[PDB]
Design a protein around this nucleic acid. Structure first.
Ligand SMILES: Nc1ncnc2c1ncn2[C@@H]1O[C@H](C[C@@H](N)CC[C@H](N)C(=O)O)[C@@H](O)[C@H]1O
Ligand SMILES: Nc1ncnc2c1ncn2[C@@H]1O[C@H](C[C@@H](N)CC[C@H](N)C(=O)O)[C@@H](O)[C@H]1O
Lengths: 249, 239
RNA sequence: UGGGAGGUCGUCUAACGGUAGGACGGCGGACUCUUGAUCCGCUGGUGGAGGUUCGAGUCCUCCCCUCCCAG
């Protein structure tokens, strides 16, 4: 079957239950499609006080993570993963994640994700132990665990069998480089807003064209830059032109 | 002054990841942050506690059921009282950045709706949501991680607890030992002269922002000092 | 509203001139789930008149509606 192994270095491994025990990802773990193993630098501290942070040279802001426990946890994980494992550091200074980046990352059979805490980690550990740096966004969080879980989740949607029997038709934003179209479910009418008749028509071809047209229109209006480097069928061009002409004028 | 966050989620226990650990966890124990959850499942009225439903027009996937979700949001909105903004986590919403974080931070109470499956009914977005927010241009299986990400980012602004502070990437950091794998700490950081260090670190932030994320640089009004240091760094990059 | 072609459940697709079926949809139900998974019932059609024939979705006439070709 399909399997992916993700090694994680984190002071708070229990946080990862958030993805391993719940939802689609929880079932994927429960079906062995996805494996996540964690190592905690705290289990590697020679300190009698199980101390895991150290002071930054130059004084200043907060604390940095202590080098020894963190380095030892990385070497232990790296050794267990064996050969062919790419080591990633979660950091806001890293490559900003997008769907293309998710597909590329999804190209790895094994990954080790290093989650920082405090002011971050010693720059030299990054030079000597890290392969790639990735950011989940231009904002600062208190630790790398949320970013790591985010990365894991995004790639897990790409593991065959995770979403279910023939999930090729499963529609989500960016999946095909376009934003998703709007969705509707029961009731037929509530809060005075009805459902577009075409979705109730049972007319298959029109529903397909409506959905595609909605997706093009929404992408155009909210995120056109996605539109700048896209490959499209004649049908998509036509459908988009209809949409731009109609919202406009 | 503290922050209150309402959350609508089918998996409220996921939020322990932020309420029981690290800085945000400490914030919770000291009552500097409250995170209350409502689960649409507690609002169902059927034998199987159904919280999803099929989308009209057929095809694969499910959407969240309108009624339980709606009822939960109205209940949370009711508990929050006046002034609570309802935010829906979605990849089609406004992309979070440090500015968006500061604006969200102004709000005293927020309610966060976490989607699952293929999403939520469009009419709920039109009728119950004030603003839509995305954590990035990629797709997740649920809104819980994005909700926690947002909560974590804004919590940093809660009294009693910088990179992006000035629009720049952070500078590199070092701690003991002085030599690690043949790599020594830059002498300036050990010189003990606060002024030389400040200028060195600032020069590093400027250089790094330029090299990794030059676009961040376009929107800024650098001080005379910053312009000089960046100019120096660009000259060193390829002299 | 000139010259060709064509009308079957909401849509798609079958039926020798012999009891109109299937898939999807819509409604509803089980799975005993967090099932973005899979099953199971129910609903529903020959556009309309004539006529031929023991019998017509099918063949003939007319009417109507629809697509294609220059309004
Ligand atoms: N946007 C982000 N993407 C990836 N990791 C992040 C992000 N924001 C914070 N982190 C991680 O969580 C912690 C953030 C803080 N320790 C501050 C980090 C520090 N500003 C730095 O330059 O790395 C670090 O471990 C970061 O790696
Ligand atoms: N980029 C994102 N930012 C914030 N929330 C997200 C993001 N991606 C997915 N989600 C959450 O994940 C839930 C389930 C998603 N599969 C829904 C995606 C939806 N079909 C769309 O493409 O717009 C969504 O309802 C959101 O709550």
């Amino acid at each position: 079957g399909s399997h992916m192994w993700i090694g994680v270095i984190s002071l708070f491994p229990e946080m990862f239950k958030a993805i391993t025990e719940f939802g689609v990802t929880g079932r994927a773990v429960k079906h062995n499609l996805l494996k996540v193993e964690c190592w905690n630098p705290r289990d590697f501290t020679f300190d009698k006080h199980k101390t895991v942070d150290d002071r930054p040279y130059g004084g200043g802001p907060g604390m940095l993570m202590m080098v020894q426990p963190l380095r030892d946890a990385i070497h232990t994980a790296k050794a267990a993963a064996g050969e062919g494992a790419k080591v990633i550091y979660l950091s806001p200074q890293g490559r900003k994640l997008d769907q293309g980046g998710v597909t590329e990352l999804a190209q790895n059979q094994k990954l080790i994700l290093v989650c920082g805490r405090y002011e971050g980690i010693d720059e030299r550990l990054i030079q000597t132990e890290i392969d790639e740096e990735w950011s989940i966004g231009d904002y600062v969080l208190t630790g790398g665990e949320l970013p790591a879980m985010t990365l894991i989740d995004a790639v897990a949607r790409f593991i065959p069998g995770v979403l279910g029997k023939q999930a090729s038709a499963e529609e989500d934003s960016f999946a095909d480089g376009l934003l998703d179209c709007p969705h509707y479910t029961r009731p037929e009418v509530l809060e005075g807003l009805t459902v577009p008749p075409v979705l109730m028509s049972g007319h298959h071809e029109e529903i397909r064209k409506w959905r595609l047209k909605q997706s093009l229109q929404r992408t155009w209006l909210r995120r056109p830059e996605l539109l700048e480097g896209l490959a499209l069928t004649d049908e998509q061009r036509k459908l988009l032109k209809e949409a731009q002409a109609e919202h406009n004028s």
